[PDB]
Structure formats: structure tokens, C-alpha cells
Design a protein around this ligand. Sequence first.
Ligand code: MET
Lengths: 306, 306
Amino acid sequence: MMIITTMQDAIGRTPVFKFTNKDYPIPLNSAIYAKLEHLNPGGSVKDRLGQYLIGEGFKTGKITSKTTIIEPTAGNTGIALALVAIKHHLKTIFVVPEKFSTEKQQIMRALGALVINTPTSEGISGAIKKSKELAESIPDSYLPLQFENPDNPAAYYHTLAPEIVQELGTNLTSFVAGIGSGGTFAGTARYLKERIPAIRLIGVEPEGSILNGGEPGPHEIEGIGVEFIPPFFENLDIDGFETISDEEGFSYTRKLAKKNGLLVGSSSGAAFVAALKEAQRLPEGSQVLTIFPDVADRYLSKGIYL
Amino acid sequence: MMIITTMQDAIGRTPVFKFTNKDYPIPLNSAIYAKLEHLNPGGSVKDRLGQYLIGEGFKTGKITSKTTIIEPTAGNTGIALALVAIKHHLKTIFVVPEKFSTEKQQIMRALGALVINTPTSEGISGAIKKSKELAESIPDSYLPLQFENPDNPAAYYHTLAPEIVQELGTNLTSFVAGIGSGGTFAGTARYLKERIPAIRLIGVEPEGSILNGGEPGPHEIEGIGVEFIPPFFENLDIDGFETISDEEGFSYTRKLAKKNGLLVGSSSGAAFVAALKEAQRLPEGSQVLTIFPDVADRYLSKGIYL
Ligand code: MET
């Protein structure tokens, strides 16, 4: 491999898992390609976001040696920012709704971050509000606000999307990806659409998310789901959103481990189910791309694998 | 990176982290290189053992298509064997003392293994006894018994050690590694000694292990420690053993996360402190190799980072 002097040097260049009709009920000569972002050193796709936000921040002068980074997060963005902050010894404060993965919060604190909790029932919106309060009261603070910052999708446009095309070329029928903030989906989709105008775009949410108009509500699937429509979707021709039940998402999370040796989180299982439904509706020979965002190990304290 | 159809394709080719006097009290022009085996897809160095045992088993006829693999394990070897078994659809049975490592047992089961528990107070020896009973009573079984099988050190001799010399060359002063069964240390040391006759060999154990003549007793560090001499050391010229207290091992586990963004187990922290002591006693310009065996994530329920 390589000799590294920073864990930042290990971010990206992740493999792609190829699934065919020999693995799962998929049409003849069709394939699903899953970009394995869980193999990042921070254990999620958000490692790329962290690296990009801090890197660009130093270039624009939004981040200096004096800066405290404050961000609301479900966990992974916090881990990624804390990991990347180490090289420049930046202080970090993450606002996390309480019952999101305790493992992720432990890891954030292990990396030197302060973790402040908000109530689970105010969701991510409550975390955003609280993060804004802290920033006003902390000198030299910087609030990336992944939920609205166009640098969120741009991170993936510039890092993850080029890697996909480098490995897979332009022979893709569809791109299917879970939506939380919407950055991964929107940034990657923009890049693919520029090179593959005919590609189909499917966003994936759990039951109790609002993208298909349904009522908001709790869901065991963690990492995806929106409480507000992401602002990153305006220039995008999205073909549909796929709503995945907890039962189905966890079922395919368990199958990915048992059948394929992939130890991925419930948001990966959800994305995979959505990719299987998309492959099943397309002609033979279709090539469907998805992303597996994070590792299963941060959810062992919950049901995952039961 | 690559397109893979089995998670086995992703075993090995791990990076090496280089530490200098910028990071820790290491003499001028000296360095510590840590082979990052925690980044294997099963989360540990044992992935190499699993891959080797199954590969060679097919080669010698010890394993065929409807062999059942049986092994007593306190976790990582079970994960590795279960992960590798998937490709060839082999069934696996692991005998694990109840209360040894829950997270690791969950992962074993997730990968398709049957996990059978023994009493905690009978320790690993109770698991070994029970595993022996199963093997006799199951036709076409295979019972590696890693703790006495010479194929344990051979795995590292053939896989890990050549990879290290390809990346780092022959300018190594010392090899410092934790001892559980002793396979990693013995296999790697044999190969390094052949290529680098002057290399120093230091085995690492926690307090309450017996290699430096201390009294046997429990230790919170997980994965390393012996209550008796491993049978793998007969033809090794070992320079010393380093006994690491739980306080020191856990302290350096926390430092690796906080200072370096490395999320590694307590046996990595222990190895690292031993490597730091070794670097500190050698001339300027010395190059010390160590191995970080596994990921921190499987120990968050045990307060690894408190
Ligand atoms: C977009 S939320 C930020 C963190 C990541 N979504 C997680 O699940 O931890």
C-alpha cells in the first residue's frame, strides 16, 4: 500500500463491490456497483466532506489557526471533521440529538471533540438551532452548516464522483443513493449527469422521512431521512425517491453481511434494497451505482444484526 | 482502488503509519512504523490467518466443499474465518466463553457462524475443550487450534511479513509486536530475521502475563497476554519482552486517537508504547516496526476511550 504520516492520506480511493444475478435476484447481465465508503479511515463517506470543508475553509479564510468548528450532526460528519481537524489542531464542538449512535459520540470525544446533546424529538433541526446559538457566543467560530452549504455537494463532485467514473467509465444506467443532508447524492449526481446525461437518479429515504410527501416520524434506519427538503436538488432531474421500511432495510443489512461479508450500517442496506428495486425495473444489461456510507460497528449497541 | 466480488479480495495490502520525533519522544532521525492491520475488512490482523488457513486447507485436502470449520476463539480469529468462509460457502462453528467479547460474537453470527458459549470462569481453556468434543462428533470437521498449530505463524510468514519488506525494505532495527497465541510475532519475526539478520525482536505482553517472570493475573488489555510459554518460539532469537500496564496501554490507545486519528484497540496502544520504549533505547536513526492488530470500535461498550 503506502507509508502515511496522517490518516487524512488514507481518505478515499475506496473499492467498488460488484453484485450480479449470481448474488441477488437482478435481471440477466445487469449489475449493481456499490462504492464502499465505509472503508474510509473515519468509517464513513463523510471523511471526504470533512477533508473538503476544512481544506477549502483554509483557502477562503473562513478557517484559521484560531477557529473553533461547530457543526450539528447525526455522528459521521462529526467524526470526519474531528479526524481532519487533528492535523491543524482545530477545536471542534458537535451538537448531536441524544439517541443517535452513542458509539459515534464516544469516537468524536476520543478524537478531541466536545459533544453537546439536544432532544431526539427536535431532531436535526433542533441541533441546527443549538449550533447557531453556540457560534454567536464563541469567538472565531465557524459553522459549516452541511444542511445548506453548497460546499457539501461540491465535496463529492470533486472527490467521490471522479473516482467512480475512473473505475466504472460512463456505462451507468442509474445512480441510487440515500439522502440525509442530500450532499452525497446531489454532488455525485451533478458530476455523473455532466458525463452521462441519460443516467437515472433515485434518492433513498426511510419510512417517516418526507421526500415522498409522507408524515414525519421515527425510523430505526440511521443516517438517511430528512426533516426538511434539501436545498441542493433544484437543478436536478430526479427520477424518483424510494421509501424503504425499517424491516426491509435491516433485512438487507443482515443479508449483505451473511452473503457478501460486508459489515455496513442500515443506511447501506436501505440503499442496496433501493438499488435492487431499480435493477428489477430496468432492462437486462443495466448497470446501477449506489453508495454504502458507513460501517455496521457503530450500531452494535442497537439492534443491528438482530 | 478496484472492483471486488468478495470481501476477501480486500484482505491485506494495508498502509504503514510513520511516527517521528514530531509526534512522540522518538530520537532524532529515528522512526516507528506501524502496520495498520486494523484496516483489514474484518477489522483485524487475523483476516490474514483466516485466509491462509482456508487457502492451505483446500491445498492439503484438510478442507473440502462440505467441511465444517470449528475453532475456540475470544473473537478476531472467528471473525476472520467466518469472513473468508463466505466465498467457498463453508459452515463455521466458534466456541467463545460467554462474556468474552459480545460485539465480536455479534459480528461472527452476522457473517453466518454458529457461536456456542462456555462459562466465563473456565476461560479460553473451557472453549478449547468443548471445541475438541464437537470435532470428534462432526464428520469432515476441521479444527485449526491456532494456539498450537504451526500454520498460525506460517500464515504471517507467507503474507504479512513479505508485504512489510516490500513497503519498508531491509532498514529495520527492531520488530516489536504483541503476543497472544504468539503466531503474528513468531511468523513475522522468522521472515524478518531471514532477510535482516541483525534485527532485534521484542514481544509485548500486558501486566499479569508471565513472559518476564511476573505472576499470572487478569488485565484489561485485550488480545495479548499469556499464562504460559507459546510453543512457537523454539528457534527464535528473542531480545526481550516488554510488560505494559493497563494504565499505560490504555493511555497510549487514547493518545493514538486524540493525537493521530488512529482508532485502534488496547493491544495496539500496548504495542505502540513498547515500540516507543524500544525506539528510546536505540541509537538515533533507528527504525522500529510494530503492528496494530485491531479496531477500537469493538471495545466502545467496555469504555476503551475513558
Ligand atoms: C448528515 S448527518 C451527519 C453525520 C452522518 N449523517 C451520520 O449518520 O452520522
